[PDB]
Amino acid sequence: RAFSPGLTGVLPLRETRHLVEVLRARVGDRFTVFDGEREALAEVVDLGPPLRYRVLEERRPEREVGVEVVLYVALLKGDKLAEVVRAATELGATRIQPLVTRHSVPKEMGEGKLRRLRAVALEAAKQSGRVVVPEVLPPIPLKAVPQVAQGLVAHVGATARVREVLDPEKPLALAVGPEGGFAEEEVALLEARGFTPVSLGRRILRAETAALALLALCTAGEGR
Ligand SMILES: C[S@@+](CC[C@H](N)C(=O)[O-])C[C@H]1O[C@@H](n2cnc3c(N)ncnc32)[C@H](O)[C@@H]1O
């Protein structure tokens, strides 16, 4: 795959070189090009440089992470979850699950909130390139959080880095605590669901910044 800003048929110097120089490209070879916004298949026309290609068929850029990415975040005060669902949507979350935690101020979510979150979601995906829209389900209790093939819980009291446990091939389950945070009993209770504690640095982070940090380290970090 090559990088061509705009898919105009003119591969920038760097791209032209590597393909012909290193990869050893010739006239006829069918490769793909993308500019980050769209993509398509091509057929090396002239080696230039710059190498001029022939777009054969417009492709649909891979936008999804690859595995299911569930975000279990505690109900936040105000419209915080609105900023979370947005960033999370553009970060790869394929499903967002609000959680009712001991210290989570709000204990429930009205159809109005669940409405705006879904609105924000279906918009964030649209504005991120994603065609898939993350599912924003009605809140539930921690106890409901099922067993997970893989789970990471942003825990201030942890020593494990995400890049030391993250298994790219297996689905992903994330968990962030409310403004107050997860209760010592809640945390371990999640670990009993398959959630491995993870640190997001040596500074206190808002539930929103925490969900973003965690998410970014499991997708944007791995370049997926
Ligand atoms: C802002 S914290 C609540 C206050 C925090 N327990 C404290 O006393 O420092 C809410 C959530 O943000 C996430 N978080 C914030 N800072 C974190 C950190 N340094 N490491 C891991 N998670 C963190 C966790 O999900 C935490 O439950």
Short mmCIF file of C-alpha atoms and ligand atoms in Angstrom, two decimals:
data_model
loop_
_atom_site.label_atom_id
_atom_site.label_comp_id
_atom_site.label_asym_id
_atom_site.label_seq_id
_atom_site.Cartn_x
_atom_site.Cartn_y
_atom_site.Cartn_z
CA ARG A 1 0.00 0.00 0.00
CA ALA A 2 1.26 3.46 -0.97
CA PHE A 3 0.50 6.99 0.25
CA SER A 4 -0.91 9.46 -2.29
CA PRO A 5 -2.58 12.62 -0.86
CA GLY A 6 -5.84 12.89 -2.80
CA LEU A 7 -5.39 9.79 -4.96
CA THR A 8 -4.62 12.06 -7.90
CA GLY A 9 -2.34 9.55 -9.61
CA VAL A 10 0.91 11.23 -8.59
CA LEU A 11 2.77 9.41 -5.81
CA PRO A 12 4.92 11.87 -3.83
CA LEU A 13 8.70 11.51 -4.14
CA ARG A 14 9.08 9.37 -1.01
CA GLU A 15 6.35 6.93 -2.09
CA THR A 16 7.61 6.75 -5.67
CA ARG A 17 11.14 5.89 -4.55
CA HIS A 18 10.42 3.15 -1.97
CA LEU A 19 8.07 1.35 -4.39
CA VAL A 20 10.43 1.39 -7.37
CA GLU A 21 13.68 1.75 -5.44
CA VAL A 22 13.24 -0.73 -2.58
CA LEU A 23 10.16 -2.83 -3.38
CA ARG A 24 11.31 -2.80 -7.03
CA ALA A 25 8.15 -1.79 -8.90
CA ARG A 26 7.52 -2.06 -12.64
CA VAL A 27 4.91 -1.02 -15.22
CA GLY A 28 1.81 -3.16 -14.79
CA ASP A 29 2.13 -3.99 -11.09
CA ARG A 30 -1.19 -3.53 -9.29
CA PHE A 31 -0.83 -1.86 -5.89
CA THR A 32 -3.13 0.22 -3.68
CA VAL A 33 -2.94 3.88 -2.66
CA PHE A 34 -4.59 6.00 0.05
CA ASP A 35 -4.47 9.53 1.45
CA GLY A 36 -6.12 8.77 4.77
CA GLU A 37 -9.56 9.90 3.65
CA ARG A 38 -10.29 7.38 0.90
CA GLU A 39 -8.56 4.59 -1.03
CA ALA A 40 -8.43 2.59 -4.27
CA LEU A 41 -6.54 -0.03 -6.27
CA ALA A 42 -4.09 0.98 -8.99
CA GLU A 43 -1.75 -0.27 -11.72
CA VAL A 44 1.73 1.29 -11.96
CA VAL A 45 1.78 3.17 -15.27
CA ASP A 46 5.03 5.12 -15.61
CA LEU A 47 7.94 4.82 -13.16
CA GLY A 48 8.69 8.52 -13.49
CA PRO A 49 9.86 9.57 -11.02
CA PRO A 50 7.39 10.48 -9.75
CA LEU A 51 5.65 7.16 -10.40
CA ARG A 52 2.32 7.61 -12.18
CA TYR A 53 -0.28 4.93 -11.48
CA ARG A 54 -3.66 3.94 -12.91
CA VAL A 55 -6.54 3.73 -10.42
CA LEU A 56 -8.46 0.52 -11.15
CA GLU A 57 -11.13 0.41 -8.42
CA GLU A 58 -12.06 2.58 -5.44
CA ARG A 59 -11.66 0.62 -2.20
CA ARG A 60 -13.17 1.06 1.25
CA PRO A 61 -10.33 1.97 3.67
CA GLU A 62 -10.04 -0.28 6.71
CA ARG A 63 -11.50 1.82 9.52
CA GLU A 64 -12.20 -0.72 12.24
CA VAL A 65 -9.67 -1.95 14.79
CA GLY A 66 -10.10 -5.60 13.89
CA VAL A 67 -11.56 -7.01 17.09
CA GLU A 68 -14.55 -6.01 19.21
CA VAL A 69 -13.71 -3.07 21.46
CA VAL A 70 -16.08 -2.67 24.40
CA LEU A 71 -15.78 0.33 26.72
CA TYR A 72 -17.30 -0.11 30.18
CA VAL A 73 -17.35 3.38 31.67
CA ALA A 74 -19.08 4.47 34.86
CA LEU A 75 -21.90 6.98 34.52
CA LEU A 76 -20.40 10.45 34.74
CA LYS A 77 -21.96 13.70 35.95
CA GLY A 78 -23.35 16.16 33.43
CA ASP A 79 -22.64 15.46 29.76
CA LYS A 80 -19.16 13.99 30.24
CA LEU A 81 -20.13 10.69 28.60
CA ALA A 82 -20.92 12.78 25.54
CA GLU A 83 -17.25 13.68 25.11
CA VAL A 84 -16.27 10.09 25.89
CA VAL A 85 -18.58 8.45 23.37
CA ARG A 86 -17.27 10.84 20.72
CA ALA A 87 -13.55 10.28 21.28
CA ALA A 88 -14.15 6.57 21.90
CA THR A 89 -16.01 6.31 18.60
CA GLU A 90 -13.12 7.81 16.66
CA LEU A 91 -10.72 5.67 18.68
CA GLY A 92 -12.31 2.37 17.69
CA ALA A 93 -14.79 1.37 20.40
CA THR A 94 -17.34 -0.89 18.71
CA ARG A 95 -19.55 -0.80 21.78
CA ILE A 96 -19.92 1.50 24.78
CA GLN A 97 -21.49 0.22 28.00
CA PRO A 98 -22.38 2.73 30.75
CA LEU A 99 -21.90 1.24 34.22
CA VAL A 100 -23.60 2.03 37.52
CA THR A 101 -20.79 1.98 40.06
CA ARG A 102 -20.93 2.55 43.81
CA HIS A 103 -19.35 6.00 43.62
CA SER A 104 -20.92 6.94 40.28
CA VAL A 105 -23.10 9.96 41.17
CA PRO A 106 -25.84 9.29 38.60
CA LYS A 107 -27.48 5.91 39.15
CA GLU A 108 -29.46 5.75 35.92
CA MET A 109 -29.70 7.22 32.44
CA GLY A 110 -32.85 8.65 30.92
CA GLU A 111 -33.86 7.91 27.34
CA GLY A 112 -32.85 11.49 26.61
CA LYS A 113 -29.20 10.98 27.50
CA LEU A 114 -29.01 7.56 25.85
CA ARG A 115 -30.52 9.40 22.88
CA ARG A 116 -27.84 12.10 22.61
CA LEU A 117 -25.03 9.60 23.18
CA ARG A 118 -26.28 7.55 20.25
CA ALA A 119 -26.55 10.76 18.28
CA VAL A 120 -22.98 11.73 19.17
CA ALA A 121 -21.82 8.21 18.36
CA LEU A 122 -23.42 7.94 14.92
CA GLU A 123 -21.90 11.35 14.17
CA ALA A 124 -18.40 10.71 15.53
CA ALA A 125 -18.09 7.61 13.35
CA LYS A 126 -19.30 9.58 10.35
CA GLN A 127 -16.73 12.28 11.08
CA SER A 128 -13.97 9.73 11.69
CA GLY A 129 -14.49 7.70 8.54
CA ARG A 130 -16.04 4.78 10.36
CA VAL A 131 -19.14 3.37 8.69
CA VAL A 132 -19.91 1.22 11.73
CA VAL A 133 -21.67 2.97 14.60
CA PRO A 134 -20.68 2.06 18.19
CA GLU A 135 -23.57 0.71 20.26
CA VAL A 136 -24.40 2.90 23.24
CA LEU A 137 -26.47 0.65 25.49
CA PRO A 138 -28.53 1.58 28.58
CA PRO A 139 -26.57 1.64 31.86
CA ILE A 140 -26.08 -1.53 33.95
CA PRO A 141 -24.35 -2.58 37.19
CA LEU A 142 -20.72 -3.72 37.38
CA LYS A 143 -21.89 -7.19 38.39
CA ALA A 144 -23.39 -7.39 34.91
CA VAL A 145 -19.97 -6.99 33.27
CA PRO A 146 -19.49 -10.54 31.85
CA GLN A 147 -16.37 -12.64 31.44
CA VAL A 148 -13.96 -11.21 28.90
CA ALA A 149 -11.42 -12.92 26.65
CA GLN A 150 -9.38 -9.82 27.42
CA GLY A 151 -10.02 -6.88 29.72
CA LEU A 152 -8.07 -3.82 30.79
CA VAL A 153 -9.18 -1.64 33.70
CA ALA A 154 -7.53 1.76 34.07
CA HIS A 155 -6.56 1.57 37.73
CA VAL A 156 -4.57 4.29 39.49
CA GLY A 157 -3.24 1.56 41.76
CA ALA A 158 -1.52 -0.63 39.18
CA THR A 159 1.98 -1.42 37.93
CA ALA A 160 1.25 -2.98 34.54
CA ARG A 161 1.66 -1.01 31.31
CA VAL A 162 -0.97 -1.59 28.63
CA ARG A 163 1.64 -2.43 26.00
CA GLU A 164 2.80 -5.23 28.29
CA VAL A 165 -0.55 -7.04 28.35
CA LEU A 166 -2.49 -5.91 25.27
CA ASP A 167 -3.16 -8.85 22.96
CA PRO A 168 -4.05 -7.36 19.53
CA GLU A 169 -5.55 -10.61 18.22
CA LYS A 170 -8.12 -11.02 20.99
CA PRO A 171 -11.18 -8.78 21.50
CA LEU A 172 -10.87 -5.87 23.91
CA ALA A 173 -12.73 -4.85 27.06
CA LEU A 174 -11.93 -1.58 28.81
CA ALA A 175 -13.10 -0.13 32.13
CA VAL A 176 -12.82 3.34 33.66
CA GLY A 177 -14.05 4.50 37.06
CA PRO A 178 -16.40 7.46 37.73
CA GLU A 179 -15.30 10.83 39.09
CA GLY A 180 -14.84 9.08 42.41
CA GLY A 181 -13.50 5.88 40.93
CA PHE A 182 -13.92 2.13 41.30
CA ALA A 183 -14.24 0.78 44.83
CA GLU A 184 -11.46 -1.55 46.02
CA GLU A 185 -14.14 -4.25 45.97
CA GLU A 186 -15.34 -3.19 42.52
CA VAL A 187 -11.87 -3.29 40.99
CA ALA A 188 -10.97 -6.82 42.09
CA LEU A 189 -14.54 -7.81 41.23
CA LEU A 190 -13.75 -6.82 37.64
CA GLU A 191 -10.41 -8.64 37.72
CA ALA A 192 -12.59 -11.67 38.45
CA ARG A 193 -14.21 -11.01 35.07
CA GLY A 194 -10.91 -11.08 33.23
CA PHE A 195 -9.82 -7.46 33.67
CA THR A 196 -6.11 -6.79 34.13
CA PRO A 197 -5.30 -3.58 36.05
CA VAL A 198 -3.39 -1.01 34.00
CA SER A 199 -1.68 2.30 34.74
CA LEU A 200 -2.25 5.47 32.72
CA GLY A 201 0.69 7.39 34.15
CA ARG A 202 1.63 8.88 37.50
CA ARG A 203 -1.01 11.63 37.52
CA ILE A 204 -4.71 11.63 38.36
CA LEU A 205 -6.86 11.70 35.23
CA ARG A 206 -10.50 12.61 34.72
CA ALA A 207 -12.77 9.71 33.76
CA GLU A 208 -12.93 11.19 30.26
CA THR A 209 -9.17 11.60 29.82
CA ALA A 210 -8.80 8.09 31.24
CA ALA A 211 -11.12 6.47 28.71
CA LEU A 212 -9.34 8.33 25.91
CA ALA A 213 -5.87 7.40 27.17
CA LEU A 214 -6.77 3.75 27.60
CA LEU A 215 -8.50 3.56 24.22
CA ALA A 216 -5.68 5.34 22.38
CA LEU A 217 -3.14 2.88 23.81
CA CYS A 218 -5.08 -0.10 22.46
CA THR A 219 -5.89 1.19 18.99
CA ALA A 220 -4.35 4.50 17.90
CA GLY A 221 -1.16 3.27 19.53
CA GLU A 222 -1.05 0.04 17.56
CA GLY A 223 -1.91 2.05 14.47
CA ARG A 224 -5.22 0.25 13.99
C1 LIG B 1 -10.37 10.45 38.29
S1 LIG B 1 -10.37 8.78 38.91
C2 LIG B 1 -11.03 9.07 40.59
C3 LIG B 1 -9.99 9.64 41.56
C4 LIG B 1 -8.80 8.69 41.72
N1 LIG B 1 -9.27 7.39 42.20
C5 LIG B 1 -7.80 9.27 42.73
O1 LIG B 1 -8.19 9.36 43.91
O2 LIG B 1 -6.68 9.60 42.29
C6 LIG B 1 -11.64 8.02 37.84
C7 LIG B 1 -11.06 7.00 36.85
O3 LIG B 1 -10.10 7.57 35.95
C8 LIG B 1 -9.18 6.53 35.59
N2 LIG B 1 -7.83 6.96 36.00
C9 LIG B 1 -7.49 8.20 36.38
N3 LIG B 1 -6.18 8.25 36.59
C10 LIG B 1 -5.68 7.04 36.35
C11 LIG B 1 -4.40 6.50 36.38
N4 LIG B 1 -3.35 7.26 36.70
N5 LIG B 1 -4.23 5.21 36.07
C12 LIG B 1 -5.26 4.45 35.73
N6 LIG B 1 -6.49 4.93 35.68
C13 LIG B 1 -6.73 6.22 35.98
C14 LIG B 1 -9.61 5.28 36.37
O4 LIG B 1 -10.60 4.57 35.62
C15 LIG B 1 -10.27 5.92 37.59
O5 LIG B 1 -11.19 5.00 38.17
#
